Amino acid sequence: CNLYRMEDKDWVSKWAQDAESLINLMPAYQMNPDQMGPIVRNTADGKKQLVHARWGLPSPIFVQKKAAEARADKLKAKGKAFDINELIRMEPDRGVTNVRKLNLPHWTRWFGVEHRCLVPVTSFAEPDPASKQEGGNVPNAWFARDEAKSLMFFAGIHVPQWKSVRKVRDGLTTDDLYGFLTTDPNDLVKPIHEKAMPVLLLTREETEIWMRAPWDEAKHLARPLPNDALIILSREPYGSSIV
Numbered sequence: 001c002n003l004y005r006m007e008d009k010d011w012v013s014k015w016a017q018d019a020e021s022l023i024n025l026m027p028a029y030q031m032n033p034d035q036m037g038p039i040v041r042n043t044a045d046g047k048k049q050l051v052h053a054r055w056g057l058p059s060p061i062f063v064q065k066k067a068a069e070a071r072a073d074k075l076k077a078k079g080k081a082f083d084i085n086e087l088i089r090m091e092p093d094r095g096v097t098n099v100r101k102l103n104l105p106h107w108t109r110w111f112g113v114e115h116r117c118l119v120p121v122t123s124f125a126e127p128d129p130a131s132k133q134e135g136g137n138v139p140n141a142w143f144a145r146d147e148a149k150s151l152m153f154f155a156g157i158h159v160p161q162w163k164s165v166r167k168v169r170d171g172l173t174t175d176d177l178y179g180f181l182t183t184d185p186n187d188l189v190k191p192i193h194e195k196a197m198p199v200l201l202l203t204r205e206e207t208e209i210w211m212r213a214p215w216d217e218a219k220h221l222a223r224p225l226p227n228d229a230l231i232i233l234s235r236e237p238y239g240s241s242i243v
Contacts, residue, residue: 001097001098001124001125001126001182001197001198002032002033002097002098003030003031003032003124003125003140004030004031004121004123004124004125004154004198005028005029005030005031005121005122005123005124005125005142005242006028006029006031006037006038006120006121006122007027007028007029007122007123007149007242008120008122008149008151009027011120011151012025012050015040015118015120015151015153015207016040016048016050016118018048019040019048019049019050020047020048020049020050021049021050022049022050022051023038023050023051023052025038025050026038028242028243029243030241030242030243031055032055033055033056033094033095033097034054034055034056034094034095034166034167035054035055036052036053036054036055037052037053037055037119037178038050038051038052038120039051039052039053039117039118039119039120039156039158039178040117040118040120040211041053041115041116041117041118041156041158041160041176041178042113042114042115042116042117042211043114044114048211051176052176053117053158053175053176053177053178054095054166054175054176054177054178055095055097055177055178055179056093056094056095056096056097056166056177056178056179057095057096057097057099057110057157057159057177057178057179058093058095058096058159058162058164058177059093059094059095059096060104060106061106064088064091064093065088065091067091067092068084068087068088068091069084069087071087071091072084072087089172090165090172091165092165092166092167092168093164093165093166094166095166095177095179096179097179097180098179098180098181098182098196098198099157099179099180099181099182100181100182100183100196102181102219102222107157110157110159111157111215111218111219112215113211113212113213113214115157115158115159116156116157116158116210116211116212116218117156117157117158117178117211118153118154118156118201118207118210118211119153119154119155119156119178119180120151120152120153121151121152121153121154121200122144122149122150122151122152123142123143123144123149123233124142124143124154124198125140125141125142125143126140126141126143126189126192126193126197127139127140127141127192127193128140128141128192128193128235130191130192131235136237136238137237137238137239138238139235139236139237139238140235140236140237140238140240141192141193141232141234141235142232142233142234142235142236143188143189143230143231143232143233144230144231144233145202145229145230145231146231147231147233149233152200152201152202153200153201153206153207153210154180154181154198154199154200154201155180155181155199155200155201155210155218155221155222156178156179156180156181157178157179157180157181158176158177158178158179159176159177159178160176160177161174161175161176162174162175162176162177180198180199181198181199181222182196182197182198182199183196183197183198183199183222183223183224184196184197184224185197185224186224186225186226186227186229186230187227188227188228188230188232189224189230192232197224197225199221199222199223200225200229201221202225202229206221209221
C-alpha cells in the first residue's frame with residue numbers, strides 16, 4: 001500500500017517501552033509517500049529507537065541510472081554537456097514504499113537484524129477503482145483489524161542516514177528512510193486491489209521474530225493474513241483525511 005493511518009494514542013508504553021524515544025509523537029497520522037512517519041527501528045548497537053523516518057527506501061541503482069540516462073538524452077539532444085556520473089548522483093529518488101521481491105539483489109543488503117523496524121498502523125488503504133465514478137478520482141477501501149482499529153505493525157526495513165536527492169528543490173540530503181514488505185492479497189483484499197496487500201504483524205511473538213530473528217527465519221512471516229483477520233472499515237474518496 002501507499003497510504004495508511006496510525007491513530008493509536010497509547011501504544012509506546014506496551015510495545016516500545018525499552019525503545020529510545022527522541023521524537024515528539026503526533027496524536028494521529030495519515031501517511032503518504034516520502035512523508036515522515038513513526039517507526040521503531042533496531043540499531044547497529046543492538047538497541048531500539050522510536051524515531052521519525054522518511055517513507056521510501058532507496059531505489060535500485062539501475063532504476064535510478066535509467067532516469068539519469070533519459071535525462072541525459074534530452075540534454076544531449078538539447079545541445080548541453082553533462083556528466084553521466086554527476087547526473088546519477090543528483091538524480092531524484094522518490095523512494096520505494098514497498099518491498100515485494102525478497103530475492104531481488106537490491107534488497108539483500110538490508111535484511112540483517114540491524115535494519116529491521118516496526119511500523120505502527122491502525123488502518124491502511126488500497127485503491128478501489130471498482131467504485132470510482134465517471135467524473136471522479138479513484139477512491140480507496142480502508143482495512144483494519146477491527147472497528148476499534150486495534151494497533152498492528154507492518155514488517156519494516158529501515159536505512160539510516162541515506163544521502164540522495166529526495167526532492168530536486170531540496171537538493172542532496174541525508175535522511176533516515178523506511179519501508180515495509182508487501183505480499184499477495186488474500187480473498188478479502190484481492191476483489192478490491194489485485195496488485196498486493198501489506199505484510200502485517202498481529203501479535204507480540206510475531207513482532208519479536210521480526211525484530212530479533214535472522215532473515216532465514218523472519219522472511220517467512222511475509223505472507224498474507226488469514227481471510228478473516230481483517231475488515232473493510234470504510235470506503236472513502238481520494239483525499240479523505242483524519243488530519
